[PDB]
Structure formats: structure tokens, C-alpha cells
């Protein structure tokens, strides 16, 4: 299928405390493969998937140098934004950055992203044209003027269409055994009486990869929803994911209900009947 690489960066100022806390993670699809954590002993870019360990020491020295550099630039930007907004030095503030690229089944660039947030809200973002910026407020307009003057969009475009794609393509090859697999969901269905007259029917999807999935309860073929309790998709902790959908049904009619499961690891969607 198609594939994606994403890096997520969080800097949190802790005033009177140490330097800002900085955590960086990288993913290919829903698989984490690197991390950098300034509160960890390592002070280096560390592997989090096995297929990245075959990268040589020059890779780990470049990614580590770049992560430290990202940390430093965030530290400075924290002070800059504090000045733009006239916020006091005593409060803790957060910069978050996401960027990365998508390729299709042919390995060609399909989408690229770079977005920056301050205190949990959009700050500035590269547009899908990879040439212009959206500034979320008055302060980000200051940054937008600077980045227009310094040709930042072209530099980001070069990275997104270039080294981002090159690395993603390599990681997909070096980790094809895992990154390019799908694990289909294993579905359970469980019965939970609420009274003599009602019962919950819970449809489970377990051990599935990648995380995107759709669970629907249907009564006589008709997609319930409205009264279908759905929980957020959640990590099992082994690289697979879980989810369940629950529907309260009148006692006696459970056999009319069916659970519908759509997932990319399934050749056809499933309909399971109670």
C-alpha cells in the first residue's frame, strides 16, 4: 500500500527547573522507530525498531546532531514566542512540530507536511502547495514574514520531496518484513446482560496492524451507530492495536445483530453474526 514517515517534536519549558524538556519520536506508518529524550541518560538518538539498527554510526551521529540542533532552536523559539505574546517568564509553554512525507505504492512522493504549534494550537503551517504558509494568529504572522524573507518554504519542500522520501524508501526496504505486513484483526464478540430485558453486545477487534479500522454494529443489516459506544483505538503494546464497539440491545433480539469490521489486512470486510 501507501506509506508515511512522521516526526513529532515536543519542547516544554520548565522555568526555574532544568532546560526545556525535549522529546522527539519518528514513525513509519504506525510503527515507532527512533526516539530522542533529553531526560534520558543517552543524550543520543536511540533505536525503537530493529530494522533501523542496521544503520551505520554515521547515521546515528547525524540524527543525533540534528536532534540536539532541533532542541536548541526550540529553546530559542520558546523565548521568542514569550516575547511576541508578552507572557511572563514563570509559566511553562510548549512548542510542537510535526513533519514528514507520504509515498504511494509506486514509491513516489504523494504528500508532504510541516506544521508548528504553540501551547496546543496551530501556530504556523506549510500549505499543501509546499510554497506558502498559513499563520494562525498575529504572532505567527511575524514568523511568516521572516520565513517568506528567508525562503523557508523552498527549503522545507526540498527536504520533504528529497531526503524525507529517500529515508522512508530505505526504511521500507530494510524493514519490509514488518513495515509491509498487515495483521488482520481477530474479532471477539461478548454478551453482557444489563437487566432481564437488555444486554450489551461488545464487538472486539484485536491484534491488528496498521491502526486504522472501522467497527460498526448492524441490526438486520442496518448500521446502528447513534447508540453504539465506540472506544478510541488503543495500542496493545506489542505493535498491534485494539478497539471495541458496544451496543445495548433488547433481550431476545441479539441474534438479529451483526458486527461489521473493515481493515486493510482483510481481503473483504467481515460481517459476524451473534
Amino acid at each position: 500500500g501507501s506509506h508515511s514517515m512522521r516526526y513529532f517534536f515536543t519542547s516544554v519549558s520548565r522555568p526555574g527547573r532544568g532546560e526545556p524538556r525535549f522529546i522527539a519520536v519518528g514513525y513509519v506508518d504506525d510503527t515507532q522507530f527512533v526516539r530522542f529524550d533529553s531526560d534520558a541518560a543517552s543524550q543520543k538518538m536511540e533505536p525503537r525498531a530493529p530494522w533501523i539498527e542496521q544503520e551505520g554510526p554515521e547515521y546515528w551521529d547525524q540524527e543525533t546532531r540534528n536532534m540536539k540542533a532541533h532542541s536548541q532552536t526550540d529553546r530559542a523559539n520558546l523565548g521568542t514566542l514569550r516575547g511576541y505574546y508578552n507572557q511572563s517568564e514563570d509559566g511553562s509553554h510548549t512548542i510542537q512540530i510535526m513533519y514528514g512525507c507520504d509515498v504511494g505504492p509506486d514509491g513516489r512522493f504523494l504528500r508532504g507536511y510541516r506544521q508548528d504549534a504553540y501551547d496546543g494550537k496551530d501556530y504556523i503551517a506549510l500549505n499543501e502547495d509546499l510554497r506558502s504558509w498559513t499563520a494562525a494568529d498575529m504572532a505567527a504572522q511575524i514568523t511568516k514574514r521572516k520565513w517568506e524573507a528567508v525562503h523557508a518554504a523552498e527549503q522545507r519542500r526540498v527536504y520533504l520531496e528529497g531526503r524525507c522520501v529517500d529515508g522512508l524508501r530505505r526504511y521500507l526496504e530494510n524493514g519490509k518484513e514488518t513495515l509491509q505486513r498487515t495483521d488482520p484483526p481477530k474479532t471477539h464478540m461478548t454478551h453482557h446482560p444489563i437487566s432481564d430485558h437488555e444486554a450489551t453486545l461488545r464487538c472486539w477487534a484485536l491484534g491488528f496492524y496498521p491502526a486504522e479500522i472501522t467497527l460498526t454494529w448492524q441490526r438486520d443489516g442496518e448500521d446502528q451507530t447513534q447508540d453504539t459506544e465506540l472506544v478510541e483505538t488503543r495500542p496493545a503494546g506489542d505493535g498491534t492495536f485494539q478497539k471495541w464497539a458496544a451496543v445495548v440491545v433488547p433481550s431476545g433480539e441479539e441474534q438479529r445483530y451483526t458486527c461489521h469490521v473493515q481493515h486493510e489486512g482483510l481481503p473483504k470486510p467481515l460481517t459476524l453474526r451473534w
Partner: peptide, 12 residues
């Protein structure tokens, strides 16, 4: 592979 945060393009 991460991007570079060392140019004027990274400064707010």
C-alpha cells in the same frame, strides 16, 4: 531521516 533545524528558516 530528520530535517535540519540550523538555518534562518527554523527561527520564529
Amino acid at each position: 531521516e530528520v530535517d535540519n533545524a540550523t538555518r534562518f528558516a527554523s527561527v520564529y
